[PDB]
């Protein structure tokens, strides 16, 4: 697969992650690594070298936000009232 189709891949493929899709960015930074940071055999690598730099800080941005919501919910679940219960998808049975 040529560099033109790879550039047409990894710009729309990055552009999809702005619709709340961090797993797209995860398989992005997991997939173009040994083909963008191992072999220096491309003049058309500088877009692909930059996009995974633009995608690495984008994904781990969500890893802060998601676990900082998960912990702040699981700790402050019973201390909140029914507000901590209307937005609960599953509810554990015996524990409050």
């Amino acid at each position: 697969v040529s560099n033109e189709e790879k550039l047409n891949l990894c710009r729309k493929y990055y552009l999809g992650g702005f619709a709340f899709l961090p797993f797209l960015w995860l398989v992005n930074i997991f997939w173009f690594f040994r083909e963008a940071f191992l072999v220096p055999a491309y003049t058309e690598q500088s877009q692909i070298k930059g996009y995974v730099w633009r995608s690495a800080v984008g994904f781990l941005f969500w890893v802060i936000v998601l676990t900082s919501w998960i912990t702040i919910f699981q700790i402050y679940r019973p201390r909140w009232g029914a507000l901590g219960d209307y937005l609960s998808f599953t509810i554990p049975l015996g524990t409050p």
Binding site: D85, Y86, I91, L93, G94
Partner: protein, 667 residues
């Protein structure tokens, strides 16, 4: 599988400690998910709790108590130390505790009567008389560990024998680490209160598929009838007068479905059913100037479920007998013991500050004593000290109307019942015991002294109701018989699968009559055993039989007589025609209707309410218990070390052999 037969032993006759919930609190017991495992340690003296509380090598124990040690102070010492106790099993005692045992509170149904700081302030939290004087409050404490009851003695012998085989400590040393243990499963799906639980079960029932309901309203039906039939599709006229006779129908205990309720429940509605069939046999009963309604409220322990419901439907115009129509109210409390043939007449003192109501109550007590003077075995007394009213169903009607009412009971001060709302409140409490050389068919028809006492109580009550309806000519004809009383006592208290309870029910309902006695707990299963048995027993004792085919009995609309509005019909089984299986079924033209008993806090859906008995029950799944052996942590660490050692050794030897597969193998 055949290996878990070598590991576990089930326990088959158990009764758990089930969590219930209030608006502001919860009561009961709960395990974790997947049980609580602990080493068995029996307790046969109060010195043995050194081994559990302080001197235990194997900390999360599981104590086994005789039920005569199941005290309040012992429960305080166990609830104050819960990191070392996960479980409890309680074995029943046949020489019942002569100190008495009542797990209910010191003053039942306190915040739901009439007496408040606005109405009856000197009588309010029963400051004058503590009614349940022995009550230690133990059945209203929350607990963090399972408490099961061992109904059998042989299971107790099995568990104690395994304790003697394994868990002993010799010569002041450690127990040998293959030890016996026991596991108790009761994971209640509910939490802090009924507001939380009802909301949390309302969201799961609405906003999602697979409704995960966790709580359940305690609900049942109020069985009620009339002496003379009424329309049931409208109401009565504003000048009609009925005389309500009333009696609770249920009980409970500390444990889940063991609700024997002999002195507190069974004797009272047995003598009222006898009063009903005595009054029905009057020769002038069609032309009475008033009417008589019998009612058997259910839910009365849990803060007057059926009584408050009957009042609320009676004032919201949804009941054919309105609250204008109630002339007099004769409640029937506990009447089984009667320590010196005395029968006390409890009235309300606060509503007698109105003068005309006071004169009506004085006329009521004069009527009671006039109708009771004809019986030489009942001595009617009234309390000298002007003291309040016992916890009964008149304390819901008096929240609305100030009807002229009286509560008959056998106690002036505290309860004579040593086992109020207890497991011990069985047939042996009221001296109901049959001789041992008789067939269990003649045990149905054998007459006890308790039956002959309750027959005299029912004779007094029936003649009282006959005079209250203005009967005034045939008073000696009204008399109950000990035969129906002893058949009802044997039916409820000893064996429910009678030859007489079978011949009064429909064909569909014979699954309700089990082997033992009926337990009297208001369950969520909305008609109960006891509700049907009382309904069809009242339907026999008041109704008559008619010639109708069964298809006519399903719908009597085609018959010019036999109205559908006034009466109600049932195709019941017959008696057994001998030498074959030939029931001879027939219709009954009775009036034993049912009414809904579910508190108006669950109809107005205001689940944090302070006057309508917000009691619910947790839902669960697979209450079970089992015993087994446990192994040391030394053996678990050794078996995991041997697993890792064999795995690492096999990988190293295979990787060494495969890498030298050239040299080691030649052709």
């Amino acid at each position: 599988n055949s290996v878990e037969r070598k590991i576990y032993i089930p326990l088959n006759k158990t009764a758990p400690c089930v969590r219930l919930l209030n608006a502001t609190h919860q009561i009961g017991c709960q395990s974790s998910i997947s049980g609580d495992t602990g080493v068995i340690h029996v307790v046969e003296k109060e010195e043995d709790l050194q081994w559990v509380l302080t001197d235990g090598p194997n900390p999360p124990y599981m104590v086994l108590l005789e039920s005569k040690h199941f005290t309040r102070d012992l429960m305080e010492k166990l609830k104050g130390r819960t990191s070392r106790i996960a479980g409890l099993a309680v074995s029943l005692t046949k020489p019942s505790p002569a100190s008495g045992f009542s797990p209910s509170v010191q003053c039942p149904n306190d915040g739901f009567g009439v007496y408040s700081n606005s109405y009856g302030p000197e009588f309010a939290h029963c400051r004058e008389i503590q009614w349940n004087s022995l009550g230690n409050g133990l059945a209203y404490e929350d607990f963090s560990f399972p408490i099961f009851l061992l109904e059998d003695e042989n299971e107790t012998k099995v568990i104690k024998q395994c304790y003697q085989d394994h868990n002993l400590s010799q010569n002041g040393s450690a127990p040998t680490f293959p030890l016996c243990a026991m596991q108790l499963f009761s994971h209640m799906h509910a939490v802090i209160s009924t507001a939380t639980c009802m909301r949390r079960s309302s969201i799961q029932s609405t906003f999602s598929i697979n409704p995960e309901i966790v709580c359940d309203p305690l609900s049942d039906y109020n069985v009620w009838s009339m002496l003379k039939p009424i329309n049931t599709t409208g109401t009565l006229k504003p000048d009609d007068r009925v005389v309500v006779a009333a009696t609770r129908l249920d009980s409970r205990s500390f444990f889940w479905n063991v609700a024997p309720g002999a002195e507190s429940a069974v004797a009272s509605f047995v003598t009222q059913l006898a009063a009903a069939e005595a009054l029905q046999k009057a020769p002038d009963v069609t032309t009475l100037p008033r009417n008589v309604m019998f009612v058997f409220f259910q839910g009365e322990t849990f803060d007057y479920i059926g009584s408050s419901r009957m009042v609320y439907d009676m004032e919201k115009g949804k009941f054919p007998v309105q609250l204008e129509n109630v002339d007099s109210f004769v409640e029937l409390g506990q009447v089984a013991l009667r320590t010196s043939l005395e029968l006390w007449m409890h009235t309300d003192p606060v509503s007698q500050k109105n003068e005309s109501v006071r004169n009506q109550v004085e006329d009521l007590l004069a009527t009671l004593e006039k109708s009771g003077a004809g019986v030489p075995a009942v001595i009617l007394r009234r309390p000298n000290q002007s003291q309040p009213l016992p916890p009964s169903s008149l304390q819901r009607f008096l929240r609305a109307r100030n009807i002229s009412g009286v509560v008959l009971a056998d106690h002036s001060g505290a309860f004579h019942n040593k086992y109020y709302q207890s497991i011990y409140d069985t047939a042996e409490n009221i001296n109901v015991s049959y001789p041992e050389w008789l067939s269990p068919e003649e045990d149905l028809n054998f007459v006890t002294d308790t039956a002959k006492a309750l027959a005299d109580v029912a004779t007094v009550l029936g003649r009282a109701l006959y005079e209250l309806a203005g009967g005034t000519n045939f008073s000696d004809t009204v008399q109950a018989d000990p035969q129906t009383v002893t058949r009802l006592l044997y039916g409820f208290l000893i064996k429910a699968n009678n030859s007489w309870f079978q011949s009064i029910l429909r064909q569909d309902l014979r699954s309700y009559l089990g082997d033992g006695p009926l337990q009297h707990y208001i369950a969520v299963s909305s008609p109960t055993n006891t509700t049907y048995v009382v309904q069809y027993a009242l339907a026999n004792l008041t109704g008559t039989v008619v010639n109708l085919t069964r298809e006519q009995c399903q719908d009597p609309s085609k018959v010019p007589s036999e109205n559908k509005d006034l009466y109600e019909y049932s195709w019941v089984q017959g008696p057994l025609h001998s030498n074959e299986t030939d029931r001879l079924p027939r219709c009954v033209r009775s009036t034993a209707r049912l009414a809904r008993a579910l508190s108006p806090a669950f109809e107005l859906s205001q689940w944090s309410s302070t006057e309508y008995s917000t009691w619910t029950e947790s839902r669960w799944k697979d209450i079970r218990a089992r015993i087994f052996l446990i192994a040391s942590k030394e053996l678990e660490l050794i078996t995991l070390t041997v697993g890792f050692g064999i795995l690492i050794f096999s990988l190293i030897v295979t990787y060494c052999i495969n890498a030298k597969a050239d040299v080691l193998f030649i052709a």
